[PDB]
Predict the structure of Proteinase K.
Amino acid sequence: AAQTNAPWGLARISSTSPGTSTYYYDESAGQGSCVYVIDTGIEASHPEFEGRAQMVKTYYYSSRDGNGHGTHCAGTVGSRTYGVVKKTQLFGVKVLDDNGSGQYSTIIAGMDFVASDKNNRNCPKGVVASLSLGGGYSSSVNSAAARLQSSGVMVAVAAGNNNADARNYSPASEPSVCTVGASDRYDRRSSFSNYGSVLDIFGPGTSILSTWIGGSTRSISGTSMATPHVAGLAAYLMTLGKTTAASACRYIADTANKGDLSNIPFGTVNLLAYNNYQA
Ligand SMILES: [Cl-]
């Protein structure tokens, strides 16, 4: 399948070169997979989600996304125009308030929720969790992410936006989950992207067009935007039968575009998420 005039990050994920604008993918499009977006919520009514999004949990007075961040991330995973896996099922878990903040205890509860809740859902091709969130190092937050991964969920987490070593942030620093840095449309490390040995992969994160609340769209930047490219890619590859939840981060690194990014510090992987889709 070909999507013309695609956001640059979707074209980049299906390309061996920067500078193209068509996204190419197998028409299976993550059907039969599930992605949990653990964030500020998802505006499930947005036409871009086509009824494939729903809120399953909130820790606040509403399940609605009063911020936009979670809607944007969910759009990069699985919206019809802005998404990597255009037929996945999206489940929203609101651990972040409408100011985009959340207590670590709530984030942990939301991870343990997804590990159980997947057993209430139909995801024959597998389960992914996308965590465009984090804060300072916490062994308890890393452990929660490790449990979720162990339970059979492909966990993708943002490296963080401090232009620093991600070893000092959680859940970025958890070794067993997929930690995602951000790049720009010229294959440079995004200026804000964390780096370090705990990164597994880079995905598009500068100037990413996706869904927003009020049935709208906008372009924003962050390792928050790179993470759902990888979460969507995992869901797509799991539907194709190419990998499993336990091995998808490894598989994505194995099949990445290698050595194409600039301003990658010595000792950080130079790997850019790639779907290796051949028509
Ligand atoms: Cl809910």
Summary: The helical segments are 8-13, 69-78, 104-117, 139-150, 223-239, 248-255. The radius of gyration is 16 Å. The domain at 1-279 is CATH 3.40.50.200 (Rossmann fold). The first strand starts at residue 2 and ends at 3.
